[PDB]
Motif scaffolding. Structure first.
Motif, mmCIF file in Angstrom:
data_model
loop_
_atom_site.group_PDB
_atom_site.id
_atom_site.type_symbol
_atom_site.label_atom_id
_atom_site.label_comp_id
_atom_site.label_asym_id
_atom_site.label_seq_id
_atom_site.Cartn_x
_atom_site.Cartn_y
_atom_site.Cartn_z
ATOM 1 N N UNK C 99 -4.753 -26.093 12.558
ATOM 2 C CA UNK C 99 -4.552 -26.500 11.170
ATOM 3 C C UNK C 99 -4.896 -25.380 10.188
ATOM 4 N N UNK C 100 -5.952 -24.636 10.499
ATOM 5 C CA UNK C 100 -6.485 -23.620 9.601
ATOM 6 C C UNK C 100 -5.775 -22.273 9.787
ATOM 7 N N UNK C 101 -4.947 -22.168 10.820
ATOM 8 C CA UNK C 101 -4.122 -20.974 10.974
ATOM 9 C C UNK C 101 -2.768 -21.179 10.295
ATOM 10 N N UNK C 102 -2.463 -22.431 9.962
ATOM 11 C CA UNK C 102 -1.179 -22.777 9.359
ATOM 12 C C UNK C 102 -1.342 -23.283 7.926
ATOM 13 N N UNK C 103 -0.228 -23.348 7.199
ATOM 14 C CA UNK C 103 -0.221 -23.745 5.790
ATOM 15 C C UNK C 103 -0.875 -25.112 5.581
#
Lengths: 114, 115, 114
Positions: C99-103
């Motif tokens: 989640x935190x690597x993506x928008x």
DNA sequence: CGGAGGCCAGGGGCCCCCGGCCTCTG
DNA sequence: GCAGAGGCCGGGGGCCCCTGGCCTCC
């Protein structure tokens, strides 16, 4: 008992003093003092003097460095525990010597003849 | 390589003691001393100075909160490591300050200068 | 203000737990994260990740040894000043990275790639 | 399962004791 | 000129909370 009324003019009866002395006089059992005559070489006494007194024994000695009267009274009450003990400083050593070499005191043994 | 014979009357020589002190003196190289003089912030010193002493320097600093002698040594040792890192507490600050400023010490920098 | 609601199923919301964790997430500023991204060596991160999000960024990392959640927050609030700083342990870290690597997250740096 | 809460070693503040030193006082 | 009382002072070492791992049991 308590210290003999003889030498009460040459001892130190202070009870609240942080003052140091170069000469002391123990009072305990006869065998304790011999077990104290040899286990005292740490205050580095210049004079030691084991004597007898009515079923009990005293040790008279002189340190080269001054000491608290509380300091020397602690030391002895360690190996003793196990028997009774009392000790006071000596304000007049010369006087206090011959009263403890004359009757009813008997010179068991001492290092340097004084 | 211990502390100068002159100072050993204004310092603590305790080792098995858990006492606490407001003043400390650390003896190390020039590099580590300058490295410490900017580092000590986590002690919040009321005052600090950097002096020289023969191919090596000293740092003298009073603290706000008091500290035990080891905890200061344990902190400062966790910067470099690394060479001669010895530090005793200071039992006589002002008098100690007056020797480490004179000969043959070389006072280099300080804040609030000897009030 | 507070951790986003897209993460409330991956992080430990404990407060009285003395348990230890091998994964952590710190929620501060864009600079105060970069500042402590290059300093969290004393926890030995086998993987760390710097990400932006909103006015500030977040730091995601996993440690070689378990650590208490307090002891990392208790640590980061010393070297920093700060502004604000939130830190929860990461329970499910595989998805938490996802989640935190993506928008809406910008990934800035990391050692190992996902 | 996650969260509470109990554990224990190590750190580092706190303090008093001990035993010398000293001076001041009856 | 004594004692005695009791200041100060440096080393040792007990107390105990705080930290940050460990753990098991609801």
């Amino acid at each position: 008992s308590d210290f003999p009324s003889s030498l009460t003019g040459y001892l130190s009866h202070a009870i609240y003093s942080n003052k140091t002395f170069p000469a002391f006089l123990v009072y305990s059992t006869k065998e304790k003092c011999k077990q104290l005559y040899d286990t005292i070489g740490k205050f580095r006494p210049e004079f030691k003097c084991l004597v007898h007194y009515e079923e009990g024994g005293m040790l008279f000695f002189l340190t080269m460095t001054k000491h608290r009267v509380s300091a020397v009274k602690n030391y002895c009450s360690k190996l003793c525990s196990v028997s009774f003990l009392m000790c006071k400083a000596v304000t007049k050593p010369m006087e206090c010597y011959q009263v403890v070499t004359a009757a009813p005191f008997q010179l068991i043994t001492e290092n340097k003849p004084g």
